RNA sequence: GAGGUUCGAAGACGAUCAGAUACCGUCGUAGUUCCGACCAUAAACGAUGCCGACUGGCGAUGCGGCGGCGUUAUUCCCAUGACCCGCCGGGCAGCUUCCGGGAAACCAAAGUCUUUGGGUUCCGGGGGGAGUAUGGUUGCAAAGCUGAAACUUAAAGGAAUUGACG
């Protein structure tokens, strides 16, 4: 009403956190004068006003990670998730669910593979105008 | 590409294609793709000819390989199913990736952070990531695509006919391209299979 | 309007028929 | 469209004939009126007697008196 | 209705080569068609055409190449008196350096160059260039 | 463009689409020229040379290009008999 | 698109073309050499019949005519294959 | 400047087609033209539903519905906010979206 | 001094590409006016066509902003047209030259009929047309000079057409698309598909492809 | 000539308004209703002449045909018939696109046009004066059809742009 934040704050705030995630915390008056160290914020109002999102983005972070955000742990976290994999993603054990026509495609190929083929039901088609 | 002998279709390969369902097309059919289909079943699902599907796949290989400097091949995905994929062929070949937003004239603009005058696109869906194709009209950009049956072929050098719908299938193609592009020239025997699995290539939904 | 001047003249000419026909 | 045929030299001539009584610049020249109407009977100049001197008031945007002669 | 069977055909073989069509068939066929297409064959303006013999009229199937910019037809066959042949080939062809007014004289159907070597006039048909 | 003295005038000879034989613009920016590699014949491996291969804008914006790539490629022995 | 070998059109894609539109105009009709149960006699019925085809014998009636092909009566065979 | 390709009208393939006088201004309009709401309003409404369901001699009871085919001339359609007045791109989008 | 950001830019300043015919050949977008400044140093004399003041209307008076057209050419093959609108005349002009410079093309010139000497006119009768207006360029035997209105004469004289009779109509007053129609006239000389061409292209590498070693710079 | 259901020019009052011989009200004649003659015009409008050729998609639907893969039913099947899935001809239509058009709006056609002519019909040549005067003709008449000039006149107009006022 009185206070929604300006983009000098929203941008600087988000950019401190991108660069000092470890330095900050979920208090005000601590990270309040962290900002005095790591930046040259001229006015006390702004200096103080900036630790605004510095908190409102930690309260967000613990609950969840931002869809677009700057972070070191998250990037590190993402790499770990990517490495994990099934030994074969597409192996699908033995026996694929294959249409008779699909079997026909193989025959033109002339390849021979294991597989039972089932076709069933009326040709209903898709959708109900 | 038309693998007259050695770089033929094989059997271990085919089972992947069936397993992921890369041949199971969409219900509908953009005519440019009636070269690359054999039947529709009942229900109304079209069936891609894994033979043509591959020939084409090599055709893109021949063309990427052609590129002397491998890091001037843009590799796009805007839909998420490729997001992971593209990064991973890009890392395998040493090509250059764009996942998420095809950002404003990275092809046009001598001022934006990103421009790039890449010498070949590769794209997951022409349907979705359909700027870069169109910006590829203003630079002399050939263009590989991972088309479906339902996909327009405005501005494509070459269409690889696939599913490009279920993440599972997408990855495979981003594999096989990656695979062939390193088999051709690079650093694989032909005789032996990879260190690299598919599992690396086709995205994960929020799972753990 | 158009309709109400085509209807002006088709009243006015009818007065010149009447005026003329006297002589 | 146009008639275009090969024994159509008349339908053409006679077409391009009447579709000149819809030209303006010829219906001055070839009709009659002009010679009949212009005091200058088709003649470049003409002589006449000054019967009085009359000032004419110019058309609104330019105010002034023009100083002419009734001939 | 079908008045002039050239205009018919030539529209449809200009009007493919714009689209870059590889080859086209021409529905009505005729002698005059063949005889004027074989002229186009010599200066390169098309490739080999292969006339079907539906028992009635004829169909043709024209191998096109890229090379034909336009072919058209002068519809009434005016009688060209050899002195006019220039005045025509001025205002009906893009230059004096190529372009062919096919016409039909005493000694067969042929381009304007060949009527000039034999020194004959006759009736204009069309032009390709 | 020769003249009397076989003299090749004209400051360049343009490229020319492979698919339509239609001359490709000075400022036709939706042009292509796809380079496609061949192999050794036996193992695999791009070693050797090159199937260069051009296409105009119009054919691209029509939607064809890939129809018209294949047909050329399989004439040139790269692709074969699907 | 840009390459349809019109002169050598595959057999399927003439049968999905209106009779006169084909590469060569041929019909889409036929005669059938018809049995019927009583008599052994075979009549030479033309599919697209127009009239009612009566038996060379007498009593039975072979083909009610309809819009397109003729309606064969109840239990009687036919033979395309020729020409 | 043909505004609506269609002409706000929905004729095509005909000629004079039944006119119908509106349910408000009493103003005459074609059948293909004209906005055509069809209200299935409950009789009792939202409030009284439970007054009447108490006082009912009968048990449960579904209650009926009025099936009115409203049927406005465009004047009253716009004045009384049935349709509105859209952008050039929007004029086309003929779907009916709740 | 340069800082060529475009690769095509980089290749130009290190005596890498020899003649812009090597660019046009592959249909590459020039996007740095200085390129054409390498490659046609001197020559390339630049004539303003018109300074027409457009002006858009607003709550308080009218925004008035100028539109400069400039023609560019070297009386020898290459010509261009640049149209830049700006708040000020000198900005417009200066920054229209920058576009004209960019959008220069080569004009193919041919021959009256007798095939002798050097090329004095247009090969075919090309046409070019910009919104109503249209201009036809007819071939021309030597000595005839240019036979047109002022404006197409000032673009054709620049192209190094020596002779041409034209035929133009529409709203020829509207200078912009007097000049822009007869831009696309002289663009479409090199798009004219004649027997003289007609030989399958030998084909050549590409600047990006030959010199791909120097772009990944050493 | 028959008839008078409503509505309803004209027409009568009540209001509204500075006024309303208007709208908004209340009456109600001709007519709207029928049968018999005339009249011969619309924004009679897709503001797109008719025939004929050619050039892209993609969906739908009316009719007919053809083919198939369905089943609800319908019976032992059938024939059907009703749905489904295709193809084919010709119908009414839709969307979509840098064909190509198009001043523009837009247009599978307004596409094939300085790369000018498939056949043919009509018809416009700045705006008014004027669809007037006059002449002829048809009509019982309203009017219909044919249809000028002197004079005056510099723009009138069309498509899209910002404005700005509803
Ligand atoms: Mg008296
Ligand atoms: Mg009507
Ligand atoms: Mg009466
Ligand atoms: Mg009243
Ligand atoms: Mg009328
Ligand atoms: Mg028109
Ligand atoms: Mg014309
Ligand atoms: Mg006039």
Residue numbers in the entry:
A (entry chain SR): 1 to 129
B (entry chain SA): 2 to 209
C (entry chain n): 2 to 24
D (entry chain SX): 2 to 72
E (entry chain SW): 2 to 130
F (entry chain SV): 1 to 82
G (entry chain Sb): 2 to 84
H (entry chain Sa): 2 to 99
Sentences from the paper on this structure:
The S domain is involved in recognizing the targeting signal and interacting with the SRP receptor. Its functionally essential SRP54 subunit contains three modules: an N domain that interacts with the ribosome near its exit tunnel, an M domain responsible for signal recognition, and a G domain that (together with the N domain) coordinates receptor targeting. SRP is anchored on the ribosome primarily by its SRP54 subunit near the exit tunnel and the Alu domain at the ribosomal GTPase center.
A parallel structure of SRP bound after the TMD has emerged from the ribosome revealed the conformational changes that accompany TMD engagement by SRP. The overall architecture of SRP in the engaged binding mode is very similar to earlier reconstructions of this state visualized using heterologous plant–mammalian complexes. As expected, the Alu domain is localized to the GTPase center between the 40S and 60S subunits and is connected by a flexible RNA linker to the S domain positioned at the exit tunnel. The hydrophobic groove of this domain is occupied by density consistent with an alpha helix of ∼12 residues, accounting for roughly half of the nascent chain's TMD. After fitting the density corresponding to earlier crystal structures and assigning the substrate, two additional regions of helical density were observed abutting the TMD. These helices enclose the TMD substrate, minimizing the exposed hydrophobic surface area. After nascent chain binding to the M domain, αC2 would occupy a position on the opposite side of the hydrophobic groove, oriented with its hydrophobic face toward the substrate, forming part of a protective lid.
